[PDB]
């Protein structure tokens, strides 16, 4: 059962873009199909989405530009481990 996480430092959050992390052994083909499934389920509900990147090689999953309203839908997708809202990093 998948969980959601966002930056506790509220000025550092970047809402509207989410990293969907799939379970460790998920294959690239499964990541892409999950991403397209999200987009189709979203479109059915009247929501625009953009898949910005599909990850494989370290962590399986994808980066999606979408409204936060779709988060409970996305957490119910096959293979989902967790979802993290994007946030800022800074030169030290
Ligand atoms: Hg953060
Ligand atoms: Hg964060």
UniProtKB/Swiss-Prot annotation:
Q: In which tissues is it expressed?
A: Expressed in neuro-epithelioma, colon carcinoma, hepatic and pancreatic cell lines, and in Schwann cells.
Boundaries of every Inhibitor I9 domain copy: 17-89
Compartment list: Cytoplasm; Secreted; Endosome; Lysosome
Which post-translational modifications are recorded for this protein?
A: Cleavage by furin and PCSK5 generates a truncated inactive protein that is unable to induce LDLR degradation. Undergoes autocatalytic cleavage in the endoplasmic reticulum to release the propeptide from the N-terminus and the cleavage of the propeptide is strictly required for its maturation and activation. The cleaved propeptide however remains associated with the catalytic domain through non-covalent interactions, preventing potential substrates from accessing its active site. As a result, it is secreted from cells as a propeptide-containing, enzymatically inactive protein.
This chain's function reads:
Crucial player in the regulation of plasma cholesterol homeostasis. Binds to low-density lipid receptor family members: low density lipoprotein receptor (LDLR), very low density lipoprotein receptor (VLDLR), apolipoprotein E receptor (LRP1/APOER) and apolipoprotein receptor 2 (LRP8/APOER2), and promotes their degradation in intracellular acidic compartments. Acts via a non-proteolytic mechanism to enhance the degradation of the hepatic LDLR through a clathrin LDLRAP1/ARH-mediated pathway.
Q: Which family does it belong to?
A: Belongs to the peptidase S8 family.
Question: What quaternary arrangement does the UniProt entry report?
Answer: Monomer. Can self-associate to form dimers and higher multimers which may have increased LDLR degrading activity. The precursor protein but not the mature protein may form multimers. Interacts with APOB, VLDLR, LRP8/APOER2 and BACE1. The full-length immature form (pro-PCSK9) interacts with SCNN1A, SCNN1B and SCNN1G. The pro-PCSK9 form (via C-terminal domain) interacts with LDLR. Interacts (via the C-terminal domain) with ANXA2 (via repeat Annexin 1); the interaction inhibits the degradation of LDLR.
* Protein's UniProt name: Proprotein convertase subtilisin/kexin type 9
- The organism encoding this protein is Homo sapiens
């Amino acid at each position: 059962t998948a969980t959601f996480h966002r930056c506790a430092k509220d000025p550092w959050r970047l809402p509207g873009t989410y990293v969907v992390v799939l379970k460790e052994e998920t294959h690239l083909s499964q990541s892409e199909r999950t991403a397209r499934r999200l987009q189709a389920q979203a479109a059915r509900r009247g929501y625009l989405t953009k898949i910005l990147h599909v990850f494989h090689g370290l962590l399986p999953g994808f980066l999606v530009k979408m409204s936060g309203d779709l988060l409970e839908l996305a957490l119910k997708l096959p293979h989902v481990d967790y979802i993290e809202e994007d946030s800022s990093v800074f030169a030290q």
